[PDB]
Write an enzyme that holds these catalytic residues in place. Sequence first.
Site, PDB file in Angstrom:
ATOM      1  CB  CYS A 196      10.177 -17.273  -2.278  1.00 18.72           C
ATOM      2  SG  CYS A 196      10.021 -18.962  -1.596  1.00 18.72           S
ATOM      3  CB  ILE A 197      15.116 -15.705  -3.106  1.00 18.52           C
ATOM      4  CG1 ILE A 197      14.890 -16.179  -1.661  1.00 18.52           C
ATOM      5  CG2 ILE A 197      16.216 -14.630  -3.206  1.00 18.52           C
ATOM      6  CD1 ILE A 197      14.339 -15.097  -0.700  1.00 18.52           C
ATOM      7  CD  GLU A 243      -6.794   4.750   6.801  1.00 20.16           C
ATOM      8  OE1 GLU A 243      -7.304   5.180   7.868  1.00 20.16           O
ATOM      9  OE2 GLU A 243      -6.176   5.495   5.992  1.00 20.16           O
ATOM     10  CE  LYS A 261       7.282 -15.619  -5.539  1.00 15.84           C
ATOM     11  NZ  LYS A 261       5.861 -15.710  -5.319  1.00 15.84           N
ATOM     12  CB  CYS A 308      12.366 -20.920  -1.219  1.00 17.68           C
ATOM     13  SG  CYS A 308      11.889 -19.200  -0.799  1.00 17.68           S
ATOM     14  CE1 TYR A 349       3.936 -19.844  -6.077  1.00 11.46           C
ATOM     15  CE2 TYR A 349       2.268 -21.509  -5.633  1.00 11.46           C
ATOM     16  CZ  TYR A 349       3.574 -21.061  -5.535  1.00 11.46           C
ATOM     17  OH  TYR A 349       4.532 -21.815  -4.893  1.00 11.46           O
ATOM     18  CD  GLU A 389       4.056 -15.500  -7.616  1.00 12.13           C
ATOM     19  OE1 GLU A 389       5.006 -16.307  -7.764  1.00 12.13           O
ATOM     20  OE2 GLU A 389       3.560 -15.253  -6.489  1.00 12.13           O
ATOM     21  N   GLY A 446      13.145 -26.650   4.626  1.00 15.16           N
ATOM     22  CA  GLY A 446      12.866 -27.437   5.826  1.00 15.16           C
ATOM     23  C   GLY A 446      14.089 -28.175   6.351  1.00 15.16           C
ATOM     24  NE  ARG A 500      -8.950 -26.534 -11.514  1.00 15.79           N
ATOM     25  CZ  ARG A 500     -10.260 -26.574 -11.721  1.00 15.79           C
ATOM     26  NH1 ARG A 500     -11.102 -26.911 -10.755  1.00 15.79           N
ATOM     27  NH2 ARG A 500     -10.740 -26.280 -12.930  1.00 15.79           N
ATOM     28  N   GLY A 501      -8.256 -23.421  -6.633  1.00 19.02           N
ATOM     29  CA  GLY A 501      -8.098 -23.592  -5.200  1.00 19.02           C
ATOM     30  C   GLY A 501      -8.035 -22.305  -4.396  1.00 19.02           C
ATOM     31  CG  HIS A 559      -5.680   8.765   7.368  1.00 20.02           C
ATOM     32  ND1 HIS A 559      -6.288   8.233   6.252  1.00 20.02           N
ATOM     33  CD2 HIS A 559      -5.708  10.110   7.209  1.00 20.02           C
ATOM     34  CE1 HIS A 559      -6.634   9.215   5.434  1.00 20.02           C
ATOM     35  NE2 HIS A 559      -6.289  10.364   5.990  1.00 20.02           N
ATOM     36  NE  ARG A 568      -5.115 -28.868 -18.867  1.00 26.80           N
ATOM     37  CZ  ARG A 568      -4.788 -29.795 -19.760  1.00 26.80           C
ATOM     38  NH1 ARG A 568      -5.692 -30.621 -20.265  1.00 26.80           N
ATOM     39  NH2 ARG A 568      -3.521 -29.899 -20.153  1.00 26.80           N
TER      40      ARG A 568
HETATM   41  C1  LIG Z   1       1.196  18.463   9.227  1.00 22.58           C
HETATM   42  C2  LIG Z   1       0.233  17.481   9.850  1.00 22.58           C
HETATM   43  C3  LIG Z   1       0.274  16.145   9.458  1.00 22.58           C
HETATM   44  C4  LIG Z   1      -0.602  15.204  10.011  1.00 22.58           C
HETATM   45  N1  LIG Z   1      -0.514  13.879   9.591  1.00 22.58           N
HETATM   46  C5  LIG Z   1      -1.354  13.002  10.130  1.00 22.58           C
HETATM   47  C6  LIG Z   1      -1.284  11.612   9.687  1.00 22.58           C
HETATM   48  O1  LIG Z   1      -0.509  11.141   8.847  1.00 22.58           O
HETATM   49  N2  LIG Z   1      -2.230  10.780  10.311  1.00 22.58           N
HETATM   50  C7  LIG Z   1      -3.172  11.173  11.256  1.00 22.58           C
HETATM   51  O2  LIG Z   1      -3.951  10.330  11.724  1.00 22.58           O
HETATM   52  N3  LIG Z   1      -3.235  12.482  11.640  1.00 22.58           N
HETATM   53  C8  LIG Z   1      -2.361  13.339  11.107  1.00 22.58           C
HETATM   54  N4  LIG Z   1      -2.429  14.659  11.501  1.00 22.58           N
HETATM   55  C9  LIG Z   1      -3.439  15.033  12.510  1.00 22.58           C
HETATM   56  C10 LIG Z   1      -4.829  15.241  11.920  1.00 22.58           C
HETATM   57  O3  LIG Z   1      -4.773  16.248  10.911  1.00 22.58           O
HETATM   58  C11 LIG Z   1      -5.778  15.729  13.014  1.00 22.58           C
HETATM   59  O4  LIG Z   1      -5.767  14.804  14.099  1.00 22.58           O
HETATM   60  C12 LIG Z   1      -7.220  15.927  12.539  1.00 22.58           C
HETATM   61  O5  LIG Z   1      -7.260  16.781  11.391  1.00 22.58           O
HETATM   62  C13 LIG Z   1      -8.074  16.503  13.651  1.00 22.58           C
HETATM   63  O6  LIG Z   1      -9.447  16.553  13.216  1.00 22.58           O
HETATM   64  P1  LIG Z   1     -10.478  17.545  13.890  1.00 22.58           P
HETATM   65  O7  LIG Z   1     -11.849  17.213  13.306  1.00 22.58           O
HETATM   66  O8  LIG Z   1     -10.341  17.468  15.367  1.00 22.58           O
HETATM   67  O9  LIG Z   1     -10.010  19.003  13.388  1.00 22.58           O
HETATM   68  P2  LIG Z   1      -9.681  19.678  11.988  1.00 22.58           P
HETATM   69  O10 LIG Z   1      -9.440  18.633  10.947  1.00 22.58           O
HETATM   70  O11 LIG Z   1      -8.514  20.618  12.214  1.00 22.58           O
HETATM   71  O12 LIG Z   1     -11.039  20.434  11.600  1.00 22.58           O
HETATM   72  C14 LIG Z   1     -11.510  21.574  12.353  1.00 22.58           C
HETATM   73  C15 LIG Z   1     -12.067  22.571  11.361  1.00 22.58           C
HETATM   74  O13 LIG Z   1     -12.897  23.543  12.045  1.00 22.58           O
HETATM   75  C16 LIG Z   1     -12.543  24.827  11.586  1.00 22.58           C
HETATM   76  N5  LIG Z   1     -12.916  25.818  12.589  1.00 22.58           N
HETATM   77  C17 LIG Z   1     -12.160  26.247  13.650  1.00 22.58           C
HETATM   78  N6  LIG Z   1     -12.743  27.164  14.385  1.00 22.58           N
HETATM   79  C18 LIG Z   1     -13.972  27.358  13.759  1.00 22.58           C
HETATM   80  C19 LIG Z   1     -15.059  28.201  14.048  1.00 22.58           C
HETATM   81  N7  LIG Z   1     -15.093  29.045  15.086  1.00 22.58           N
HETATM   82  N8  LIG Z   1     -16.133  28.147  13.221  1.00 22.58           N
HETATM   83  C20 LIG Z   1     -16.105  27.303  12.186  1.00 22.58           C
HETATM   84  N9  LIG Z   1     -15.139  26.458  11.821  1.00 22.58           N
HETATM   85  C21 LIG Z   1     -14.087  26.532  12.654  1.00 22.58           C
HETATM   86  C22 LIG Z   1     -11.052  24.731  11.297  1.00 22.58           C
HETATM   87  O14 LIG Z   1     -10.626  25.812  10.475  1.00 22.58           O
HETATM   88  C23 LIG Z   1     -11.022  23.377  10.586  1.00 22.58           C
HETATM   89  O15 LIG Z   1     -11.425  23.500   9.225  1.00 22.58           O
HETATM   90  C24 LIG Z   1      -1.550  15.627  10.961  1.00 22.58           C
HETATM   91  C25 LIG Z   1      -1.598  16.964  11.346  1.00 22.58           C
HETATM   92  C26 LIG Z   1      -0.710  17.896  10.807  1.00 22.58           C
HETATM   93  C27 LIG Z   1      -0.795  19.343  11.239  1.00 22.58           C
HETATM   94  C1  LIG Z   2       8.611 -20.525  -8.689  1.00 30.62           C
HETATM   95  C2  LIG Z   2       8.297 -20.761  -7.230  1.00 30.62           C
HETATM   96  C3  LIG Z   2       7.992 -19.678  -6.407  1.00 30.62           C
HETATM   97  C4  LIG Z   2       7.689 -19.865  -5.053  1.00 30.62           C
HETATM   98  N1  LIG Z   2       7.400 -18.746  -4.273  1.00 30.62           N
HETATM   99  C5  LIG Z   2       7.123 -18.929  -3.009  1.00 30.62           C
HETATM  100  C6  LIG Z   2       6.833 -17.753  -2.194  1.00 30.62           C
HETATM  101  O1  LIG Z   2       6.815 -16.581  -2.584  1.00 30.62           O
HETATM  102  N2  LIG Z   2       6.561 -18.056  -0.850  1.00 30.62           N
HETATM  103  C7  LIG Z   2       6.556 -19.335  -0.281  1.00 30.62           C
HETATM  104  O2  LIG Z   2       6.305 -19.457   0.930  1.00 30.62           O
HETATM  105  N3  LIG Z   2       6.851 -20.420  -1.060  1.00 30.62           N
HETATM  106  C8  LIG Z   2       7.112 -20.216  -2.357  1.00 30.62           C
HETATM  107  N4  LIG Z   2       7.402 -21.317  -3.144  1.00 30.62           N
HETATM  108  C9  LIG Z   2       7.390 -22.651  -2.507  1.00 30.62           C
HETATM  109  C10 LIG Z   2       8.683 -22.972  -1.776  1.00 30.62           C
HETATM  110  O3  LIG Z   2       9.765 -22.930  -2.708  1.00 30.62           O
HETATM  111  C11 LIG Z   2       8.612 -24.394  -1.217  1.00 30.62           C
HETATM  112  O4  LIG Z   2       7.450 -24.551  -0.405  1.00 30.62           O
HETATM  113  C12 LIG Z   2       9.830 -24.770  -0.370  1.00 30.62           C
HETATM  114  O5  LIG Z   2      11.035 -24.604  -1.119  1.00 30.62           O
HETATM  115  C13 LIG Z   2       9.707 -26.197   0.116  1.00 30.62           C
HETATM  116  O6  LIG Z   2      10.886 -26.551   0.862  1.00 30.62           O
HETATM  117  P1  LIG Z   2      11.285 -28.062   1.055  1.00 30.62           P
HETATM  118  O7  LIG Z   2      12.374 -28.095   2.132  1.00 30.62           O
HETATM  119  O8  LIG Z   2      10.012 -28.815   1.209  1.00 30.62           O
HETATM  120  O9  LIG Z   2      11.970 -28.459  -0.325  1.00 30.62           O
HETATM  121  P2  LIG Z   2      13.078 -27.788  -1.250  1.00 30.62           P
HETATM  122  O10 LIG Z   2      13.286 -26.374  -0.850  1.00 30.62           O
HETATM  123  O11 LIG Z   2      12.650 -28.054  -2.673  1.00 30.62           O
HETATM  124  O12 LIG Z   2      14.411 -28.584  -0.882  1.00 30.62           O
HETATM  125  C14 LIG Z   2      14.574 -29.982  -1.207  1.00 30.62           C
HETATM  126  C15 LIG Z   2      16.018 -30.167  -1.600  1.00 30.62           C
HETATM  127  O13 LIG Z   2      16.380 -31.568  -1.555  1.00 30.62           O
HETATM  128  C16 LIG Z   2      17.087 -31.883  -2.738  1.00 30.62           C
HETATM  129  N5  LIG Z   2      16.968 -33.316  -2.992  1.00 30.62           N
HETATM  130  C17 LIG Z   2      15.974 -33.968  -3.675  1.00 30.62           C
HETATM  131  N6  LIG Z   2      16.137 -35.268  -3.744  1.00 30.62           N
HETATM  132  C18 LIG Z   2      17.319 -35.489  -3.047  1.00 30.62           C
HETATM  133  C19 LIG Z   2      18.049 -36.659  -2.752  1.00 30.62           C
HETATM  134  N7  LIG Z   2      17.667 -37.885  -3.127  1.00 30.62           N
HETATM  135  N8  LIG Z   2      19.197 -36.527  -2.038  1.00 30.62           N
HETATM  136  C20 LIG Z   2      19.579 -35.304  -1.659  1.00 30.62           C
HETATM  137  N9  LIG Z   2      18.980 -34.133  -1.893  1.00 30.62           N
HETATM  138  C21 LIG Z   2      17.848 -34.293  -2.589  1.00 30.62           C
HETATM  139  C22 LIG Z   2      16.480 -30.980  -3.805  1.00 30.62           C
HETATM  140  O14 LIG Z   2      17.333 -30.886  -4.943  1.00 30.62           O
HETATM  141  C23 LIG Z   2      16.377 -29.677  -3.006  1.00 30.62           C
HETATM  142  O15 LIG Z   2      17.611 -28.970  -2.953  1.00 30.62           O
HETATM  143  C24 LIG Z   2       7.710 -21.165  -4.518  1.00 30.62           C
HETATM  144  C25 LIG Z   2       8.014 -22.247  -5.342  1.00 30.62           C
HETATM  145  C26 LIG Z   2       8.311 -22.059  -6.692  1.00 30.62           C
HETATM  146  C27 LIG Z   2       8.628 -23.253  -7.563  1.00 30.62           C
END
Ligand SMILES: Cc1cc2nc3c(=O)[nH]c(=O)nc-3n(C[C@H](O)[C@H](O)[C@H](O)COP(=O)(O)OP(=O)(O)OC[C@H]3O[C@@H](n4cnc5c(N)ncnc54)[C@H](O)[C@@H]3O)c2cc1C
Ligand SMILES: Cc1cc2nc3c(=O)[nH]c(=O)nc-3n(C[C@H](O)[C@H](O)[C@H](O)COP(=O)(O)OP(=O)(O)OC[C@H]3O[C@@H](n4cnc5c(N)ncnc54)[C@H](O)[C@@H]3O)c2cc1C
Lengths: 586, 587
Positions: free
Chosen positions: A154-155, A569, A157, A149, A291, A295, A113, A317-318, A564, A312
């Site tokens: 955070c960094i 999703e 850990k 942090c 946490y 962690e 902060g 908790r919370g 997908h 304990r």
């Molecule tokens: C390589 C590749 C990667 C893809 N990756 C993604 C992805 O990551 N995410 C995503 O959202 N989409 C992805 N897609 C697109 C996704 O596969 C299509 O949008 C989806 O399968 C279309 O669904 P459909 O029901 O329209 O047809 P289809 O899933 O093709 O089903 C139609 C079925 O009817 C059959 N059929 C055809 N003619 C006849 C018939 N006369 N009589 C009976 N059965 C018949 C076919 O053989 C087939 O089995 C990918 C497509 C390809 C080619």
């Molecule tokens: C193990 C661990 C893991 C965490 N992981 C996450 C995470 O994944 N994500 C997340 O969002 N948060 C995480 N947190 C919480 C996060 O570290 C704190 O919310 C955040 O650092 C708070 O920032 P701050 O500015 O309030 O205080 P701090 O970052 O603690 O900074 C206060 C600073 O002031 C200094 N100071 C104190 N007294 C004096 C003084 N009198 N004069 C001058 N300087 C002084 C301190 O030494 C310190 O350097 C984690 C905390 C811990 C302990």
Amino acid sequence: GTSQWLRKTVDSAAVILFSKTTCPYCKKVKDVLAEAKIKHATIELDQLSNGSAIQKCLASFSKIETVPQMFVRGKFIGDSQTVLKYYSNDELAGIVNESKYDYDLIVIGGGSGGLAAGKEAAKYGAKTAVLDYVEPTPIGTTWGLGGTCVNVGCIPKKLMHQAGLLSHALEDAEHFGWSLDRSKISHNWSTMVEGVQSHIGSLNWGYKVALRDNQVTYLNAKGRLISPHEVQITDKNQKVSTITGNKIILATGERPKYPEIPGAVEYGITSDDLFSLPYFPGKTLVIGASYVALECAGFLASLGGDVTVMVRSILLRGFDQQMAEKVGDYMENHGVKFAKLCVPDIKQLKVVDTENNKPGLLLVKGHYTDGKKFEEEFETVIFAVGREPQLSKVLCETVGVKLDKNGRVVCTDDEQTTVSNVYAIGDINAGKPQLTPVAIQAGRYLARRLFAGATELTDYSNVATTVFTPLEYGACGLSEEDAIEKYGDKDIEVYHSNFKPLEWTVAHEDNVCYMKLVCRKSDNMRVLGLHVLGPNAGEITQGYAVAIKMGATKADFDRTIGIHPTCSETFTTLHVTKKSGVSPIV
Amino acid sequence: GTSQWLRKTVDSAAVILFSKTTCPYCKKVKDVLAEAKIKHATIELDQLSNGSAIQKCLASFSKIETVPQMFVRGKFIGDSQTVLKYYSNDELAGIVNESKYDYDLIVIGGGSGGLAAGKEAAKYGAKTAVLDYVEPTPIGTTWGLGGTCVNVGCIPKKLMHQAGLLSHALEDAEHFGWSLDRSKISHNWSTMVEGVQSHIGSLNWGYKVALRDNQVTYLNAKGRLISPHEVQITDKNQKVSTITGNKIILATGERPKYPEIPGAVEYGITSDDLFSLPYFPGKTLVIGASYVALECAGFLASLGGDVTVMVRSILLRGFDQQMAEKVGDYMENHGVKFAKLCVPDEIKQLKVVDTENNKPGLLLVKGHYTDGKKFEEEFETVIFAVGREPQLSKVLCETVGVKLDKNGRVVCTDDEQTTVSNVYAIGDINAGKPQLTPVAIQAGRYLARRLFAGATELTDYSNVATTVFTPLEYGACGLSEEDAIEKYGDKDIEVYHSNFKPLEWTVAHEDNVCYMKLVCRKSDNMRVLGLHVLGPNAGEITQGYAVAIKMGATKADFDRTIGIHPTCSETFTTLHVTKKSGVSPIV
Ligand SMILES: Cc1cc2nc3c(=O)[nH]c(=O)nc-3n(C[C@H](O)[C@H](O)[C@H](O)COP(=O)(O)OP(=O)(O)OC[C@H]3O[C@@H](n4cnc5c(N)ncnc54)[C@H](O)[C@@H]3O)c2cc1C
Ligand SMILES: Cc1cc2nc3c(=O)[nH]c(=O)nc-3n(C[C@H](O)[C@H](O)[C@H](O)COP(=O)(O)OP(=O)(O)OC[C@H]3O[C@@H](n4cnc5c(N)ncnc54)[C@H](O)[C@@H]3O)c2cc1C
Ligand SMILES: Cc1ccc(CC(=O)NC[C@@H]2CCCO2)cc1
Ligand SMILES: Cc1ccc(CC(=O)NC[C@@H]2CCCO2)cc1
Ligand SMILES: Cc1ccc(CC(=O)NC[C@@H]2CCCO2)cc1
């Protein structure tokens, strides 16, 4: 309304120019200030709804109603002809540096902060000092600029968590066709620690460079607020002196707690020591169930360690307790041992071996809630039993800053304390979520209100979280038990499902990942809480936090189409309710 | 209003009960229907806002205004006493099975959309048949039930993508302290393919079991619609016959295209062939530049292959071209070669595929660049990814009257109805719709509910999010930057952007290749028109924001929401550099 805003803005801005985008006399003043390297805020009156009202109100300060008008620390300096005159006569630099105080802003604490607040304030011409000091741990550990942090939170850990996740990637790789043999690979703790600490060092250096480039004064000194505008600082050589500032931001964070039992401070460690430890902890006991505890126990087990967690009462908790128990069941199935309903009552068997770079050995004695005894040997004992501020070290009682019963600062919704020029941000602000992105948003938004006339407040509601346990847990909003307590069981509907990541199929569990939406029936099935246990849970959860902020309903999730194949999703096609009794398995 | 919703619902439902939740006479009719194993839809009137008006309109069919009322296929059957009379007289089963057609629903196509439609309709008592047949590829590849995604699409391609991602997991593990030596590890193609194919086989079986447990009739047969209600089917033994249905859903999908050049069909392969290929492709040429082409080239390179992509013009036509170029630049820096502005002219065979020793052949590819220079190089495998197309001539007789567009896809209303009132089309063959698996599933399930349960909800096809699973993944939701500028004008568009570095990439040693941007409309409260992200886990990052964009998110909504730290996704919550400002987006 407008007049009260204008007076607050003029009183606290360090250097501010009132302007219009089309005014060439304003462009002339902007170019002179830029040439003299004078930083300042700017308000363009022609881009604000009530610019005409503001232009009129300015005359109560300057006796004129035209633009440009330039102010320094609450005082009208001049229009175009007058600013140019001071520039031509070598008088401008002295006028803009005139102040009752050494600094426009003193930030006590250089963490998430405080650094954010100080850098943002300097952008608008505020003369700014950031103080940071790291009091060493009981065994002597210390670190550089950047706060909890960056250095011991955070960094490191999450980097250690990633080292743990890579163990399962090595296992999975054989099933997808790669020739390695997981059984013959081992982990080197010190090689990992060296890489983590090299990254942290780059962050320490990067923050010092950032403050230099923003003209912020960085003092590596301990600060104490002794009156509203006076900060006592203590040197690395123990030299004591006093600096003064107009506005004060308290940003000093928290440090770990120890239990009051014999041997805890002398022979155990905390997370503050873990992330730079020169030897592998060995057989380890983690005391606590936050946490932080889970962690750390989680990645230590994935790196090959013999790890036990002493709980304990309950886990997390919370947090939603159904999800907390699923998190723990996964860790217990993947090698973490749990001593449930148990507390410690620590004895030293071996001193730490700095010579051969090896831990010591300890005997831990404790008891279960029924009275049975716990007794077992460990090489390392880590306490993770909460964190606390120590504001008595930071804040003299006579200043008048009010604290709550846990020692945190009581603040208004604009971060103001009971002392009008003093503000608090981050973990010491009572009742706020204790998270790094919250502290950053609070500090940046507050600096803009103080020095650039902004009005936007920080919104602390429905802030999403992620616990980076071996299987991650992401959440946004209410737990299911909190929703029911607030609205009653008959007004709450819960949709839920198990799922299996596609990446887990060829790698050979079917029904461990889980997600649910907790909804309010009488408010159009509003989504009150979202929960997910699975890989990449923080990446899954983040985008939904925007939709919940805007008031998303179950119907909004239904009408959005999935991507997908992804884990996320599954939230778009949920349909099984808990009231139906139908199984959530896939 | 209400009256013609009720008319449509009664005419279309197979078995529907109009009920009230507190009515003990309705409870007794429900329990009877469950004992007799009669599935049906139910409308609880005490839960709809205008249930009073619906009660009145029921009299127009039944002459009564009380509850319960049972209908079968548009005919009023009776109240409580009459239904129970039929039950204890052994007359009910015959009445609920009386139909003019063999089926209430025939689905032609057993893929993403068709299986979802058929299962959902059966839940409401529709007597349903699902037809599926897989015509083999030119080299003879075939596969089981479930469609393109399950067998030769999303599922195997993402599993092979994960196999490729694990190569960098192995390299990274050394920097995080693990003792392996990445340089001495190799990949076994056939071991991969066996694991992938075993998972696909479990999905084939799971769908057959799902259809049996929903009382859906599965016919592994080629279907052809010859009149509005008649479907001619052909057996695995070439036996031809005819079945009839009330409603028809066309869901037959698409197949890969080949270029009309010598040697293409004879010696090249497509994605249909790749995912069960019994030998490693070896040195490979991918012709084309779609997401299929780039995804396949990407994982083949990560598995250790020598891979070239031949690009006619641009990468990822129809996607944001700034992002498409960043995708290709990453691929080229990480071991994919590109032959730019190039098309093929012929494939010549040099060596026949060796089935015995499980080895590819060897081919000579001739082509030319757009300036006139020549291309000539040898490859072991040539993969064509130059688009996909339906073949509705095989499925649909011209005399039925179903209108197609100039690309051969079915022209439909916003409730998927064709020009023939009882025939519907879903999935990739529905003209103008995004060709994606979760779109087809939502269309199929939502359509089934409107036909057999009196639902009204339509499928929303706008702002559907996507992810391209290239080696560095690209997620998007909404408009590209160029489309937004064309629609609204450059002065009304603001773009916020930033590079980022995943925390996981620090200890593993690039600083400024991951990238994200929000394309916004100034004159509409800075509405988010499009979201774009290039980086790890991009589909997981993008999905949640698609709900916010559906709801009309503005930049102010992203600003007031707080980030989760440390994640890649949180960079979206603090964007502030605009393109108009000229300030660098680097970290
Ligand atoms: C390589 C590749 C990667 C893809 N990756 C993604 C992805 O990551 N995410 C995503 O959202 N989409 C992805 N897609 C697109 C996704 O596969 C299509 O949008 C989806 O399968 C279309 O669904 P459909 O029901 O329209 O047809 P289809 O899933 O093709 O089903 C139609 C079925 O009817 C059959 N059929 C055809 N003619 C006849 C018939 N006369 N009589 C009976 N059965 C018949 C076919 O053989 C087939 O089995 C990918 C497509 C390809 C080619
Ligand atoms: C193990 C661990 C893991 C965490 N992981 C996450 C995470 O994944 N994500 C997340 O969002 N948060 C995480 N947190 C919480 C996060 O570290 C704190 O919310 C955040 O650092 C708070 O920032 P701050 O500015 O309030 O205080 P701090 O970052 O603690 O900074 C206060 C600073 O002031 C200094 N100071 C104190 N007294 C004096 C003084 N009198 N004069 C001058 N300087 C002084 C301190 O030494 C310190 O350097 C984690 C905390 C811990 C302990
Ligand atoms: C015991 C010990 C060892 C090393 C260090 C690091 C250091 O140099 N700290 C400087 C601060 C400024 C104010 C007092 O000390 C501190 C303490
Ligand atoms: C793995 C694991 C470890 C610990 C726990 C917590 C526990 O023991 N919970 C019971 C309490 C008693 C009061 C209410 O529920 C759960 C799961
Ligand atoms: C790696 C890679 C490969 C291919 C391409 C497309 C290309 O060649 N673009 C050149 C001009 C600009 C518009 C039309 O063509 C980009 C990047």
